[PDB]
Amino acid sequence: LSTAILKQKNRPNRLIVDEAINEDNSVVSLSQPKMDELQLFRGDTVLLKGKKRREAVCIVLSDDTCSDEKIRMNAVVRNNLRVRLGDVISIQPCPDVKYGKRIHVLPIDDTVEGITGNLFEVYLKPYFLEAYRPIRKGDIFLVRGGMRAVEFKVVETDPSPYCIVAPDTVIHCEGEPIKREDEEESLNEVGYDDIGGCRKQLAQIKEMVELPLRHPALFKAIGVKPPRGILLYGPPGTGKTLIARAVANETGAFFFLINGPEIMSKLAGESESNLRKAFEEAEKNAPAIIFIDELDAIAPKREKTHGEVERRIVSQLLTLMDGLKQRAHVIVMAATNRPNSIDPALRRFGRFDREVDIGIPDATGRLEILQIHTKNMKLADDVDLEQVANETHGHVGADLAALCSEAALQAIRKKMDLIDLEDETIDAEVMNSLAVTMDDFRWALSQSNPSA
């Protein structure tokens, strides 16, 4: 009804990700009646659109064993689009791909320990030779060479984001091995999927922020001015900063984060100037989102605030909010856990004049949040998260996160006989058997707390 902006919407090119029979990194497979519909001939370089901004460029081939409404892609392409099997992706015709002449690729440290020999010769040259491979900037791809397989990251390309690797292409691979931890931090960058029990609020945020920015034509056509200040409020640990992260990673808009304490940490004036810079920055990068995290830190009630610099900063902000003209295309988002401690002048018409209530999650919310928190956790057969969702009435996302963290620690406590703090590293067998049981959760639960 109102959640309508979030609905999947069936389209010719919106296809379910299936496991590949053609195991090559550069190839995706569609059924023959699907290729005909989109007017995609055999061998055409296509543009795939995943989750969290992510893209990949592939060659399309026919497949008999593949379904009409499905697309076949291997683990690498799925990883690059940040999608698990049975996720929807957009396939797009991509006939504008120029042949690259300079690509910079770098291996991943943990997949490269012992004997360098030559990385280009043993790995990259047999991978690319006469293959006319499409690759995107930021693609993590795997190459096999004798003893074992090495993962590589595409760091730079010759045309802007993507190119075909012709025999012309100089394949630079000199430099520092990419730290595994950087790409773990990149894989586990927050998306809309990482935020649970906020469906109707995520709808509001797309309505108030994403829709006026990426489709301002609607608002101008309907003769209505888009709201320009969206305040997210709610109790401590409900997901405001997470939604902030998610928005930052999921929007097409340019995103500028301002942390409340971050601003107030800095010297008198040097903080007024940083705000100024943030608003001029957003203006400069046409369609933008300014996120002011912890608004209450920078904008408290001009009455209940003793310092002149502090009183000046609230004035500096109001001026900037009013200073953005209609044709700026900048939406200011803010988060707080004490909305009633913000200067009401900021919450007036034209400033933060729309409120999104990130409240306490319902039983279904808690289940979502538990599902998101345990996605990378080894859980036992007996763990019932619907049970955990029901026994956690007072719990916000942060509480449940801690709950899972404690339940994990209890599982570690159970394994403390075969572990010692004095050992250099932990025994191999002991590490694999680590599973968080339901009995662990029941111990976490017994120790649990709300904050509210």
Ligand X SMILES: Nc1ncnc2c1ncn2[C@@H]1O[C@H](COP(=O)(O)OP(=O)(O)OP(O)(O)=S)[C@@H](O)[C@H]1O
Q: List residues binding Mg ion (CB under 5 A).
A: 240-241
436 touches a second copy (CB under 8 A): yes
Residues 88 to 127 in contact with ligand X, rule: CB under 6 A: none
Residues 8 to 67 in contact with a second copy, rule: CB under 8 A: 9, 11, 49
Running DSSP on this structure, what letter comes out for residue 73?
A: E
Q: Which is nearer to a second copy, 157 or 238 (CB)?
A: 238
218 touches a second copy (CB under 8 A): yes
348 touches ligand X (CB under 6 A): yes
DSSP three-state, residue 276: helix
Q: Which is nearer to ligand X, 196 or 287 (CB)?
A: 196
Sorted by sequence, the CB contacts under 8 Å of residue 26 that are 6+ apart come out as: 58, 59, 131, 133, 134, 135
Report residue 146 CA to chain centroid gap: 35
Residue 50 near which of Mg ion, a second copy, ligand X, none (CB within 5-8 Å, type-dependent): none
Q: Which stretch binds a second copy (CB under 8 A): 34-42, 76-84, 139-147, 431-439?
A: 431-439
Q: Which is nearer to ligand X, 89 or 372 (CB)?
A: 372
Q: Which is nearer to ligand X, 326 or 390 (CB)?
A: 326
CB of 286 to ligand X, least distance (A): 24
User: Do the strands 133-136 and 140-145 form a parallel or antiparallel pair, or are they unpaired?
Assistant: unpaired
Residue 272 near which of a second copy, Mg ion, ligand X, none (CB within 5-8 Å, type-dependent): a second copy
DSSP three-state, residue 390: helix
CB of 201 to Mg ion, least distance (A): 15
Angle at 30 between CA 34 and CA 90, to 5 degrees: 80
CB of 58 to ligand X, least distance (A): 32
CB atoms within 10 A of CB 99: 14
369 touches ligand X (CB under 6 A): yes
Residues 409 to 428 in contact with ligand X, rule: CB under 6 A: none
End-to-end Cα spacing for the chain: 31
Q: Measure the CA–CA gap between 279 and 325, rounded to whole angstroms.
A: 12
Residue 60 near which of Mg ion, a second copy, ligand X, none (CB within 5-8 Å, type-dependent): none
DSSP three-state, residue 15: strand
Adjacent-strand bridge partners of 256: 290
Q: Which is nearer to ligand X, 43 or 236 (CB)?
A: 236
Angle at 401 between CA 400 and CA 404, to 5 degrees: 85
Show binding-site residues for ATP.
Answer: 236-242, 337, 373
Q: Which stretch binds a second copy (CB under 8 A): 34-42, 79-87, 211-219, 277-285?
A: 211-219
Q: Measure the CA–CA gap between 435 and 240, rounded to whole angstroms.
A: 31
Residues 237 to 276 in contact with ligand X, rule: CB under 6 A: 237-242
Q: Are 33 and 48 in contact (CB under 8 A)?
A: no
Q: Which is nearer to a second copy, 130 or 422 (CB)?
A: 422
Q: Measure the CA–CA gap between 48 and 28, rounded to whole angstroms.
A: 10
